[PDB]
Amino acid sequence: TPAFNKPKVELHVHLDGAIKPETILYFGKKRGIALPADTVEELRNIIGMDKPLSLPGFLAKFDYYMPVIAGCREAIKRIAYEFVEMKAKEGVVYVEVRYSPHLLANSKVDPMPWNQTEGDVTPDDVVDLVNQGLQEGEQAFGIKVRSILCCMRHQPSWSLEVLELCKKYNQKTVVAMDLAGDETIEGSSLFPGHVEAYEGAVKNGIHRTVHAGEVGSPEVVREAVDILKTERVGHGYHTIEDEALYNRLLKENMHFEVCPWSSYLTGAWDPKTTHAVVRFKNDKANYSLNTDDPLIFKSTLDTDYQMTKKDMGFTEEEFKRLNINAAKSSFLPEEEKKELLERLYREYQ
Ligand SMILES: OC[C@H]1O[C@@H](n2c[nH+]c3c2N=CN[C@H]3O)[C@H](O)[C@@H]1O
Ligand SMILES: [Zn+2]
Questions:
Q1: Which CATH architecture has domain 1-349?
Q2: What is the DSSP letter of 288?
Q3: With contact defined as beta carbons under 8 Å apart, do 213 and 234 qualify?
Q4: 133 to each of 22, 75, 98, 317, how far by Cα in Å?
Q5: 294 lines ligand 1 (CB under 6 A)
Q6: Hey, where's the site called Important for catalytic activity on this chain?
Q7: Category of 253 on φ-ψ map: left (φ > 0), alpha (ψ -120 to 50) or beta
């Protein structure tokens, strides 16, 4: 039985980290592009991981399959459509999917991702492609789906373009901007391209979220809050290491996008210590339960729910509480956010 068989809200899940192993094999074979496995089962086991590594070690899993999707219009729209079908099956009624448009493009991107040969798929085109797949999935499965464009920590020169994309496709699925990738790159939050992208988002009203405190120190979280001006913190487990900052953000009703199973495999969470989400629960903090990268973690949303339930002591009450919280902290407009809350209260009776 699912740990929580009722409607859910997900705010932290990556599109390029939520692809069907079957769809990956399809395009690898179709484009004649090398894959580390020839069957969907072998493919799952090599792309996937079931024991802790590091953030850089986990990020390396993308190198295996991205080449097969990147630069292929048909593939881009297909994974967006299929993502919606995956989530609907999980009991998710509203989802925000994040991804980097540049990492899927093969035209007007520098440096060229995955050694691709120049093509005509621009970062803009991929956003439009994802919009179409997500819209068709919304129509076909009856769940509300939005997107978040990711700035990449190591490539700040793409950040202002990501911002312009968020502006251009505002609410056309695109509801916010994120900062993702390798948090171990010292001071990456403060690169000028990133900083300028976010400041312009504040002045233009584009919503903001940032991965921080996943594997980085509380100072990375503080940088996200103070300089980048985030409205939500992706992961944020390490915040608790600085009592003052934690109690400040807690007092400020800051939303934490928690990914339980994910934190275990990236090493963000030391299994020898009590998970931060337990303290978040005990303090009644504003947080959500997320999958992050279900393809690589060989998981599903129920994975995270069982984890917190069997271990950690979560109840049905908290599950409803954190989901109403996730709905309130969504980057959805007031009219649509109101409709979502009506839905949860209706189905939580
Ligand atoms: O979705 C865009 C990118 O975000 C990065 N990503 C995915 N999961 C994570 C992540 N970066 C940091 N932490 C993780 O939650 C990947 O490099 C993927 O290519
Ligand atoms: Zn993430």
A1: Alpha-Beta Barrel (3.20)
A2: E
A3: no
A4: 18, 10, 14, 34
A5: no
A6: 235
A7: left
Q: Does 257 sit in the ligand 1 pocket, CB within 6 Å? A: no
**Residue 269: which of 318, 320, 307 has the closest Cα?**
307
Q: Could you tell me how far CA 5 lies from the centroid of its own chain?
A: 22
Cβ atoms of 16 and 292 closer than 8 Å: no
The finding on whether 208 has its CB within 6 A of some atom of ligand 1 is no
Token pair in block for residue 99: 């991804």
Element (H, E) at 263: helix 260-265
Residue nearest to atom 15 of ligand 1 (CA): 292
Instruction: Kindly report the number of other CB atoms within 10 A of residue 89's CB atom.
Output: 12
Q: Domain spans of the chain? A: 1-349
Mutate to test the pocket of ligand 1, among 155, 293, 299 (most ligand atoms within 8 A of CB): 293
Looking at ligand 1, which atom is closest to the CA of residue 214?
13
Query: How far is CA 183 from each of CA 26, 56, 187, 263, rounded to the nearest angstrom?
Result: 32, 9, 9, 14
Q: Is 304 annotated as a binding residue?
A: no
User: Is 302 marked as a binding-site residue?
Assistant: no
Q: Which atom of ligand 1 is nearest to the CA of 12?
A: 15
Write 225-231 long-range contacts (CB < 8 A, 24+): 225/249, 225/254, 227/189, 227/190, 227/195, 227/198, 228/179, 228/189, 228/194, 228/195, 228/198, 229/198, 229/199, 229/201, 229/202, 231/207, 231/255, 231/329, 231/331
Q: Give the number of other CB atoms < 10 A from CB of residue 338.
A: 12
Q: Atom 17, ligand 1: which residue's CA is nearest?
A: 181
Identify the residue whose C-alpha is closest to ligand 1 atom 1. 99
